Structure 1
Amino acid sequence: LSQQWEAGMSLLMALVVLLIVAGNVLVIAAIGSTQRLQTLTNLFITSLACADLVVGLLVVPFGATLVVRGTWLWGSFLCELWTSLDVLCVTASIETLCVIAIDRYLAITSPFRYQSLMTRARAKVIICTVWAISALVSFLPIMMHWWRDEDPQALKCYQDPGCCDFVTNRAYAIASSIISFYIPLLIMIFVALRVYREAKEQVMLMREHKALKTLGIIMGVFTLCWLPFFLVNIVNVFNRDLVPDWLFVAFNWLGYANSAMNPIIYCRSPDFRKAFKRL
């Protein structure tokens, strides 16, 4: 029965890969190549389609090989690389997002200065800084093996090339989550809020609102996709065996789904669909 699953869901995983590599890049295509979609707020969506893409390019395909065959064949050097990219795509996703939600308070209480401060020139650097931070924070602490837990259970998984199963020390399993998930989340939900308070206070701004709600969705779905997983890892610290280990995988995949989910939340803009058709 096991070999029927081995070749059974490999095809399927490959299909979801196509959802990502296709969808995100058709998004990227209609973005970079159309003027009406080149509004700044879609440049953070340029970056994000990017992160989501590297997800469905480098992280998912290699990321099956552990589920399909049950183990890692790709060498532990690559093990490190793959894991740090699995996280990088994340800190890039959330952090870029939080940049969006921090921008759109400036499309509200500070609209007058939209083009003065935020320039299609000035946001590029900001995404770049998001990826110097994403890169620093994700990629340094993994290569530092700041994530090595002395215990032999994990010790054997650090020394055995065939386990890329991610097991970390007490406090990296704290720092990791605080920095790369929690504070930016609570901050961009916090910041989404005042924006959606000022949005109630309101010739035609409706376009503004149909384009706004669809941004709201992104962070909603994101939070629902990567919260259940980044909620777990805390219980990982508090009670170990209260947390079944198959779920530990089910949620990192549930989150992978975000990537393929994104381009299809962009089916909501006709600005976009018009460039999607002729595309």
Structure 2
Amino acid sequence: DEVWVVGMGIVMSLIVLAIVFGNVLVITAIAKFERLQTVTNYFITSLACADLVMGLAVVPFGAAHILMKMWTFGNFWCEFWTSIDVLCVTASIWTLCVIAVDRYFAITSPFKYQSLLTKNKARVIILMVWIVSGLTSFLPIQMHWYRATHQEAINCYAEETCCDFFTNQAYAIASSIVSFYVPLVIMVFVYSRVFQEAKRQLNIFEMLRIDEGLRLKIYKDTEGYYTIGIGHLLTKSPSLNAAKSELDKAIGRNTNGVITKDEAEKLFNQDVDAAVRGILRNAKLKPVYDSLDAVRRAALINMVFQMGETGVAGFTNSLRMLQQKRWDEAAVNLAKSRWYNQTPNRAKRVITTFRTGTWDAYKFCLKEHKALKTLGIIMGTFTLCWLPFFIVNIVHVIQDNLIRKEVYILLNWIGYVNSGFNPLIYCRSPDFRIAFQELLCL
């Protein structure tokens, strides 16, 4: 039809523009901004190069093929075009696999969120993934190892006006598992483990950094009291020079209302120390502390750190319920307090920790954990986009007549649109948002 060809022509043209512009933005943001020049972001540029090659050299020739219902670029470009396509998909899932293994080694090391690779070794890995994927992609195609022997396939290879990627059943099976299924199984197994590690490595220091935050300049809390660092109360007095003198005596330097990150962490270690010492020194808190597990012990310190040893000791009925290990009944009474009404988003997190004895309420709150969720989304959307195509790819090897050519090409295009989604997922990071609004002069 005449309205279908123009209507699909316009939407294909918008897909091509969105892939190219989005991916040049990612590549230049990392190239110009020092904050973004990290090992993880070098792997993300490997991924954005494949998406840019897909946008310029792969998607436009696939778009022309559908609108013209024929191949108008000759038998040479047909084989070269299929090779670049295969290479772009192969290098993409293998780099996602490398990101999963790299994040695993980081999360199971004392450095926790830093790669154990140097920026020089990361470049070698990327060139190694690009050279090997080049051999497995260009070589079987240009050597015609992929080629089917039935008459419909044989005639298509001869005529310059035909470019249907016919393959023998042995190539279709072998290249699908080595190019896609092998790195996909490793990535989902290894990255389900990084999430597990992140949640089970959460401590009281990371818990309070989520709840209190981190500010290196004097500010007023909800009580209008002067605070600094990770919830360090300076004074209840409404006087900034009286608050600035309390800093100077605590640090032993003319601070001038500003603290360095190394100084604020020293103040926080002292504050959590005073909290735990206040508990075992109190006759009402010590027995409730002794009857609690490591994570519920964190929830009780969190409370003493915020309201003081004497304030938490006033929660007699709630404390009695925690001692008897009756979490839901402890929760009803804790929720029926002024603590809950004043700071409810922090109170329901501490109350949920008491109900479950898990770190589930503190899940994907830390900046470093939000970063691991973004990577997981990039990984997940790619697999959702390409798995229907790769499933019907091996099903066609089982039974030929099971699926029509129309569904095969539509499921391939769902994979093609993925090449334009990744820049949009990078907007979850504030570092990328800042570079993008700068590059788009907003």
TM-score scaled to structure 1, two decimals? 0.96
Aligned residues: 278
> What residue identity is the alignment partner of 1:226?
W
State the alpha-carbon separation in 2 of the partners of residues 241 and 104 from structure 1.
43
> What residue identity is the alignment partner of 1:79?
C
State the alpha-carbon separation in 1 of the partners of residues 28 and 47 from structure 2.
13
2:375 to 204, 215, 221: 215
Answer yes or no: is the 8 Å Cα contact 1:106–1:114 preserved in 2.
no
Q: 1:108: which partner in 2? A: 107
What's the CA shift for 1:158? 1.2
State the alpha-carbon separation in 1 of the partners of residues 409 and 77 from structure 2.
20
Answer yes or no: is the 8 Å Cα contact 1:30–1:276 preserved in 2.
yes
Q: 2:40: which partner in 1? A: 41
State the alpha-carbon separation in 1 of the partners of residues 35 and 69 from structure 2.
46
- RCO comparison, higher one (Cα < 8 Å, 6+): 1
Q: 1:122: which partner in 2? A: 121
What's the CA shift for 1:113? 9.1
Cα RMSD for the two superposed structures: 1.5
> What residue identity is the alignment partner of 1:267?
C
Q: 1:247: which partner in 2? A: 407
> What residue identity is the alignment partner of 1:215?
L
Structure 2: runs of 5+ lacking an equivalent = 210-364
Q: 2:416: which partner in 1? A: 256
TM-score scaled to structure 2, two decimals? 0.61
Q: 2:386: which partner in 1? A: 226
State the alpha-carbon separation in 2 of the partners of residues 33 and 183 from structure 1.
35
What's the CA shift for 1:11? 2.2
State the alpha-carbon separation in 2 of the partners of residues 145 and 195 from structure 1.
41
What's the CA shift for 1:164? 1.3
Within a 5 Å distance, the mapping from 1:175-194 to structure 2 comes to: 175-194=174-193
Answer yes or no: is the 8 Å Cα contact 2:20–2:52 preserved in 1.
yes
Q: 2:30: which partner in 1? A: 31
Which secondary structure state, in structure 1, belongs to the residue aligned with residue 119 of structure 2? coil
Structure 1: runs of 5+ lacking an equivalent = none
Alpha-carbon displacement from aligned partner over 1:2-22 (angstroms, at most 9, x marks no partner): 233223322221111011000
State the alpha-carbon separation in 2 of the partners of residues 117 and 191 from structure 1.
16
State the alpha-carbon separation in 1 of the partners of residues 115 and 371 from structure 2.
22
Alpha-carbon displacement from aligned partner over 1:176-200 (angstroms, at most 9, x marks no partner): 1011010111111111111111122
Q: 1:77: which partner in 2? A: 76
Alpha-carbon displacement from aligned partner over 1:209-256 (angstroms, at most 9, x marks no partner): 111101000110010000010011010111111112211001110000
State the alpha-carbon separation in 2 of the partners of residues 133 and 3 from structure 1.
44
Within a 5 Å distance, the mapping from 1:14-163 to structure 2 comes to: 14-112=13-111, 117-163=116-162
Which of these two proteins has the greater Rg computed from alpha carbons? 2
State the alpha-carbon separation in 1 of the partners of residues 155 and 189 from structure 2.
42
